[PDB]
Design an enzyme around this catalytic site. Structure first.
Site, PDB file in Angstrom:
ATOM      1  N   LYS A   1     -73.262 -31.754   2.396  1.00 27.61           N
ATOM      2  CA  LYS A   1     -73.704 -31.854   0.989  1.00 27.61           C
ATOM      3  C   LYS A   1     -73.106 -30.693   0.210  1.00 27.61           C
ATOM      4  CE  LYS A   1     -76.757 -34.590  -0.171  1.00 27.61           C
ATOM      5  NZ  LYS A   1     -76.447 -36.024   0.020  1.00 27.61           N
TER       6      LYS A   1
ATOM      7  N   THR B   1     -76.246 -36.378   5.022  1.00 28.45           N
ATOM      8  CA  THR B   1     -75.964 -35.325   4.013  1.00 28.45           C
ATOM      9  C   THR B   1     -77.289 -35.023   3.298  1.00 28.45           C
ATOM     10  OG1 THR B   1     -75.156 -36.898   2.345  1.00 28.45           O
ATOM     11  CG2 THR B   1     -73.553 -36.113   3.905  1.00 28.45           C
ATOM     12  N   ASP B   2     -78.146 -36.045   3.154  1.00 31.58           N
ATOM     13  CA  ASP B   2     -79.486 -35.955   2.518  1.00 31.58           C
ATOM     14  C   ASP B   2     -80.370 -34.988   3.301  1.00 31.58           C
ATOM     15  OD1 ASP B   2     -81.259 -37.161   0.266  1.00 31.58           O
ATOM     16  OD2 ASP B   2     -82.510 -37.176   2.052  1.00 31.58           O
TER      17      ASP B   2
ATOM     18  N   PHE C   1     -44.626  -3.108 -18.062  1.00 31.99           N
ATOM     19  CA  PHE C   1     -43.791  -4.005 -17.218  1.00 31.99           C
ATOM     20  C   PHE C   1     -42.342  -3.854 -17.664  1.00 31.99           C
ATOM     21  CE2 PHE C   1     -42.294  -8.049 -15.301  1.00 31.99           C
ATOM     22  CZ  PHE C   1     -42.577  -7.690 -14.003  1.00 31.99           C
TER      23      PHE C   1
ATOM     24  N   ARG D   1     -48.349  -2.604 -23.315  1.00 35.74           N
ATOM     25  CA  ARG D   1     -48.759  -4.023 -23.440  1.00 35.74           C
ATOM     26  C   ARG D   1     -50.241  -4.151 -23.102  1.00 35.74           C
ATOM     27  NH1 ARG D   1     -46.742  -7.430 -18.086  1.00 35.74           N
ATOM     28  NH2 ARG D   1     -48.147  -6.302 -16.670  1.00 35.74           N
TER      29      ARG D   1
ATOM     30  N   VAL E   1     -49.234  -5.857 -12.431  1.00 35.33           N
ATOM     31  CA  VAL E   1     -50.444  -6.410 -11.768  1.00 35.33           C
ATOM     32  C   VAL E   1     -50.371  -6.098 -10.263  1.00 35.33           C
ATOM     33  CG1 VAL E   1     -51.820  -8.457 -11.320  1.00 35.33           C
ATOM     34  CG2 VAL E   1     -50.698  -8.190 -13.545  1.00 35.33           C
ATOM     35  N   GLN E   2     -49.221  -6.358  -9.635  1.00 33.36           N
ATOM     36  CA  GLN E   2     -48.942  -6.091  -8.195  1.00 33.36           C
ATOM     37  C   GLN E   2     -49.395  -4.670  -7.814  1.00 33.36           C
ATOM     38  OE1 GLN E   2     -47.047  -7.764 -10.330  1.00 33.36           O
ATOM     39  NE2 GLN E   2     -45.668  -9.206  -9.316  1.00 33.36           N
TER      40      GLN E   2
ATOM     41  N   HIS F   1     -51.494 -13.842 -20.772  1.00 31.03           N
ATOM     42  CA  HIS F   1     -50.553 -13.180 -21.703  1.00 31.03           C
ATOM     43  C   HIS F   1     -51.176 -13.122 -23.104  1.00 31.03           C
ATOM     44  CE1 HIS F   1     -48.004 -13.459 -18.265  1.00 31.03           C
ATOM     45  NE2 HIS F   1     -48.057 -14.798 -18.299  1.00 31.03           N
TER      46      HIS F   1
HETATM   47  O1  LIG Z   1     -47.513  -7.586 -14.244  1.00 30.71           O
HETATM   48  C1  LIG Z   1     -46.592  -8.392 -14.219  1.00 30.71           C
HETATM   49  N1  LIG Z   1     -46.083  -8.909 -13.042  1.00 30.71           N
HETATM   50  C2  LIG Z   1     -45.045  -9.842 -12.971  1.00 30.71           C
HETATM   51  O2  LIG Z   1     -44.615 -10.209 -11.870  1.00 30.71           O
HETATM   52  C3  LIG Z   1     -44.591 -10.283 -14.243  1.00 30.71           C
HETATM   53  N2  LIG Z   1     -43.616 -11.189 -14.578  1.00 30.71           N
HETATM   54  N3  LIG Z   1     -43.556 -11.270 -15.877  1.00 30.71           N
HETATM   55  N4  LIG Z   1     -44.456 -10.424 -16.402  1.00 30.71           N
HETATM   56  C4  LIG Z   1     -45.140  -9.818 -15.407  1.00 30.71           C
HETATM   57  N5  LIG Z   1     -46.157  -8.928 -15.389  1.00 30.71           N
HETATM   58  O1  LIG Z   2     -71.837 -42.791   3.528  1.00 30.35           O
HETATM   59  C1  LIG Z   2     -72.626 -41.907   3.839  1.00 30.35           C
HETATM   60  N1  LIG Z   2     -72.311 -40.910   4.742  1.00 30.35           N
HETATM   61  C2  LIG Z   2     -73.175 -39.875   5.112  1.00 30.35           C
HETATM   62  O2  LIG Z   2     -72.828 -39.055   5.972  1.00 30.35           O
HETATM   63  C3  LIG Z   2     -74.410 -39.890   4.411  1.00 30.35           C
HETATM   64  N2  LIG Z   2     -75.488 -39.044   4.483  1.00 30.35           N
HETATM   65  N3  LIG Z   2     -76.395 -39.458   3.645  1.00 30.35           N
HETATM   66  N4  LIG Z   2     -75.944 -40.566   3.036  1.00 30.35           N
HETATM   67  C4  LIG Z   2     -74.694 -40.841   3.469  1.00 30.35           C
HETATM   68  N5  LIG Z   2     -73.795 -41.800   3.155  1.00 30.35           N
HETATM   69  O1  LIG Z   3     -85.146 -41.802  -4.759  1.00 31.33           O
HETATM   70  C1  LIG Z   3     -84.335 -41.394  -3.943  1.00 31.33           C
HETATM   71  N1  LIG Z   3     -83.287 -42.176  -3.513  1.00 31.33           N
HETATM   72  C2  LIG Z   3     -82.320 -41.766  -2.589  1.00 31.33           C
HETATM   73  O2  LIG Z   3     -81.417 -42.544  -2.267  1.00 31.33           O
HETATM   74  C3  LIG Z   3     -82.502 -40.443  -2.109  1.00 31.33           C
HETATM   75  N2  LIG Z   3     -81.766 -39.707  -1.213  1.00 31.33           N
HETATM   76  N3  LIG Z   3     -82.331 -38.533  -1.096  1.00 31.33           N
HETATM   77  N4  LIG Z   3     -83.414 -38.477  -1.891  1.00 31.33           N
HETATM   78  C4  LIG Z   3     -83.556 -39.654  -2.540  1.00 31.33           C
HETATM   79  N5  LIG Z   3     -84.457 -40.129  -3.436  1.00 31.33           N
HETATM   80 AR   LIG Z   4     -54.715  -5.682 -12.430  1.00 35.17          AR
END
Ligand SMILES: O=c1[nH]c(=O)c2nn[nH]c2[nH]1
Ligand SMILES: O=c1[nH]c(=O)c2nn[nH]c2[nH]1
Ligand SMILES: O=c1[nH]c(=O)c2nn[nH]c2[nH]1
Ligand SMILES: [Ar]
Ligand SMILES: O=c1[nH]c(=O)c2nn[nH]c2[nH]1
Ligand SMILES: O=c1[nH]c(=O)c2nn[nH]c2[nH]1
Ligand SMILES: O=c1[nH]c(=O)c2nn[nH]c2[nH]1
Ligand SMILES: O=c1[nH]c(=O)c2nn[nH]c2[nH]1
Ligand SMILES: O=c1[nH]c(=O)c2nn[nH]c2[nH]1
Ligand SMILES: [Ar]
Ligand SMILES: [Ar]
Ligand SMILES: [Ar]
Ligand SMILES: [Ar]
Ligand SMILES: [Ar]
Ligand SMILES: [Ar]
Ligand SMILES: [Ar]
Ligand code: NA
Ligand code: NA
Ligand code: NA
Ligand code: NA
EC number: 1.7.3.3
Lengths: 295, 295, 295, 295
Positions: free
Chosen positions: D10, D57-58, D159, D176, D227-228, D256
């Protein structure tokens, strides 16, 4: 003290690219959010205030936009691989580039039955994602995912025959609501590098679409014994339909819809077979995880 | 000091209801979030700790679930009118009921081109809303809305000819991205009471759908001079198509997509006609409002 | 069809300003999020695609940062009046400016019991807000608020003597948890213009602080009969203490903490006087509003 | 196919406990959000629809509330350890319990200089967290953290001296703003079980308070090279002040604040030494991570 691990970069880089077809006048849009984190010989930036080992996060941001300009942004598996390879190749002291991408949905509008050439709708908050780990002399590790796919079925879900002890209150049920936000990952076989990624480009979109079809169809058709039993069926068929997948991972919340006892009011009957009106529970939630691989 | 205005009740009441056709076995689900606030002779609950005039927020919660058991939860214009009318009729000293409802999307899955009997998908966080004010002796004021409709078009949006002074930097454009989240409200003619609401019930679903179609079509097809000019076109179409509406109100953000100049890098060309990769701007955003009525 | 009302501008404009005392080297930071919407002769921007009457949202954004450069950003009642007055004075055809400001907390760090010259912490998402309506020929209407002030008391809250009927399940209680997020607004007497706002500037910080003290003290000390009775006590104190306020408005959720019955488990006792562990309820929540004025 | 990994439980279980002192009449409140995930011999729940191995995942949710009733909820390191031990001991086939806890702030109000006996304010969204992994015959692994500590310093951040190539636009700076949301984790030495956790109880609150003091003081006083460099100084002192910590991890965003060129407007000077007004950037952000241990 010493640095045991370090990575740094730019998070939350929002990118849009448009493809405009000269032939058909048809426009196509891509939008994503990118994170690039680098590792390598960068410890002195932490220990000795030595910024000379830092590719600035600002330059990393610039590089994301330039890579998008000069390369495809799709499939995201490819873009991620190009972008991570750039960093370990360009910079001698950089040895890994971790690239995360969320792809946002832009679906072409259908207007009066006809697909529109330059109009788009966000038809879900559902994302397509990748994690691309580009590790010098270890290759490219890609995880692809869909997330935020929200589904509910009004019946054909069961939960009975679970352990009961002094901690158990949950009533067994043979008819219940089941709602979830699907997070599903498929881990690809290790790739030797960018060349091998490019070799499998067509599998990426096709595999994602299949993952999505199998998730939706299994959820809709399975008379679920449990979230556990149903998600396992999903992973098995995905593994069976793509040999280049090594593992499938589902992370699924059980978003409870509670029955409401209204019998205290005029003996109103709203439980078991009379369950019509329910209280969606915001929290807590069941959370069920499982990684499936090949025997 | 005196009480000039008071209202109290229960906010954020999650409700689900399922209809199960006995013949067909097709199930239909409804999910919404409800808020009810009451006014009336309650002054003394504030001034004199006289709880005798409070219908407890808990009881208002109970009454929401009971009303849903005994009545249809669709259209929400009707459900909200029933619930409001209950409180001003049930309780002599309650003279007004303010009912706010957010309806969540559960669209029936198509599996193998066949509509499934009991599986649903949330296609977008787009909501359908109602605000229903039931006022003893004055009747029922209903506002209906769609919100969280997210759209983009990649071309066929312009903005030139705006005022220019020492505060202006914005370049005129004849081709730009337009993106928004549509908030669109239609205010109905006052209703005499519940009976009159009931008598118009077929108008609520139809008006919401034509509101949606007019928003989507007009946005897709108008070669927009401005958000202002495009949103006025939507309002005047909806008004023309439903005589029981008194006013239409759009509230539209301009979700900016900034061109990126890359010409500093290998002469890369990514502006005007070459503009391919953009930086979407999270904030700030244009906010454009218009209430349209009859002349 | 005709335009009955219009306003447009820039929302979500993040501003930071630092004051650096040259003598002391003490720095003071200010952060706020601003929205400006303008009304006036703009009808035709909606009806006729006449952009000539639009001050571009971009220019309004530029003007916010420029006003902040040239003027004090505190109190926000003043900053908002300056910014509003600019637009109706600068532009003949603009007749009203609606300025909304959210101020973010940057509280000076104490390091070793010594206030640091230039380090700050966000102590809570508690905001101080203003809504400033500058209307050509009618003056300046200011509403000031504190919001997101989150408080709990474990006892010295009651709720008994509420109406009971066939809709009531709630048990009367003489001892309960009371928790809320305080939204408290004070509406000032109309101001003639910017000059009059300026002349009252010492009242804005002082009234906000006594508003806060009265909220915190009254909540801490009142043996509450109800949210209703406790919030009325706060309003009437604030009114008594600032004669330029016309009305005070509380909006308070009742964030329920439910007792858990554990007696089903080894006869565990966790209700009434034994109540130790509670389940905080995310939703639903009581919502209680009151506007108090002068009799 | 076969299950390679599985855990379920999740999530998002909100708990409140009150301590009431009979002697002094002084009340003390604790609020947290708990997640418990179990592993063990549960594969058949996935592969064979066998719910007989499931502690729902729920029931896990019930057990969280019952443990809170019968045990201390503070320090959260202890509560987590008690709760995870219960599950591996109660159930023969359960071999691990993963327990995550977010602690919410309830700070005693000071009213008129005097600490109040039963009134509390949420003085930040800053959390204190733990991850407690209780693994049968491997012991207890605790990670303690603070997160959501939001800080800003107006100067004394630098620079410069970072790598510049064809990807670099960032101007070097010697003065700058630096703002971050601190996420800081200290990983404890493995504990043999619940007894050893109980043996170190006083270290948990004391170590958290020290982590927080060192973060705030270092940030406020360090003339940050980067920056480097600054985050490393933080980790070193934390390691030095607690021998039972094995590693310290900081994850810090660089939020810039962009300078605003206003010179295009009346030659307004607002950059370098004249930088007064800045644009807080929502995205993108730098993200800098580092794990520090003992040599
Ligand atoms: O700080 C900077 N690093 C870069 O490599 C660079 N290239 N253009 N301007 C720059 N400014
Ligand atoms: O398609 C699904 N995969 C999962 O792993 C899952 N877990 N909760 N719902 C799900 N749906
Ligand atoms: O109302 C719900 N529907 C769902 O599909 C669900 N999944 N987790 N919690 C949930 N609550
Ligand atoms: Ar920086
Ligand atoms: O303080 C309260 N006011 C109310 O109106 C109420 N209703 N239920 N509980 C309540 N508590
Ligand atoms: O890159 C930009 N694009 C825009 O559309 C814009 N408007 N103001 N500043 C801007 N910068
Ligand atoms: O459509 C637009 N309307 C405006 O008012 C505006 N201002 N800047 N950009 C704009 N775009
Ligand atoms: O456990 C509960 N506590 C409450 O305060 C309450 N109010 N309605 N139902 C309730 N259940
Ligand atoms: O104006 C800017 N200031 C900065 O500090 C910066 N960094 N990247 N781009 C930038 N633009
Ligand atoms: Ar993109
Ligand atoms: Ar499932
Ligand atoms: Ar419903
Ligand atoms: Ar529009
Ligand atoms: Ar500011
Ligand atoms: Ar209160
Ligand atoms: Ar607790
Ligand atoms: Na390298
Ligand atoms: Na009445
Ligand atoms: Na004017
Ligand atoms: Na065990």
């Amino acid at each position: 003290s010493a640095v045991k691990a370090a990575r740094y970069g730019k998070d939350n880089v929002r990118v849009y690219k448009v493809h405009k077809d000269e032939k058909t006048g048809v426009q196509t849009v891509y939008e994503m959010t990118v994170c690039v984190l680098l590792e390598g010989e960068i410890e002195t930036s932490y220990t000795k205030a030595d910024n000379s080992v830092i590719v600035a996060t600002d330059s990393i941001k610039n590089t994301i936009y330039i890579t998008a300009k000069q390369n495809p942004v799709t499939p995201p598996e490819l873009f991620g691989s190009i972008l991570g390879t750039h960093f370990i190749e360009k910079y001698n002291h950089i040895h890994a580039a971790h690239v995360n991408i969320v792809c946002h949905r832009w679906t072409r509008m259908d207007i009066d039955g006809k697909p529109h050439p330059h109009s788009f709708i966000r038809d879900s908050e559902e994302k397509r994602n990748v994690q691309v780990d580009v590790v010098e002399g270890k290759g490219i590790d890609i995880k692809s995912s869909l997330s935020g796919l929200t589904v509910l079925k009004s019946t054909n879900s069961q939960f009975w025959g679970f352990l009961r002890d002094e901690y158990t209150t949950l009533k067994e049920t043979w008819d219940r609501i089941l709602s979830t936000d699907v997070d599903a990952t498929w881990q690809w076989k290790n790739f030797s590098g960018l060349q091998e990624v490019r070799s499998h480009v067509p599998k990426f979109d096709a595999t994602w679409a299949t993952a999505r079809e199998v998730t939706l169809k299994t959820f809709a058709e399975d008379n679920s014994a449990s979230v556990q039993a149903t998600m396992y069926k999903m992973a098995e068929q995905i593994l069976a339909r793509q040999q280049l997948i090594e593992t499938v991972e589902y992370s699924l919340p059980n978003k409870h819809y509670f029955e409401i006892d209204l019998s205290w009011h005029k003996g109103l009957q709203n439980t078991g077979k009379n369950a019509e009106v329910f209280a969606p529970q915001s929290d807590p939630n069941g959370l069920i995880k499982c990684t499936v691989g090949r025997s």
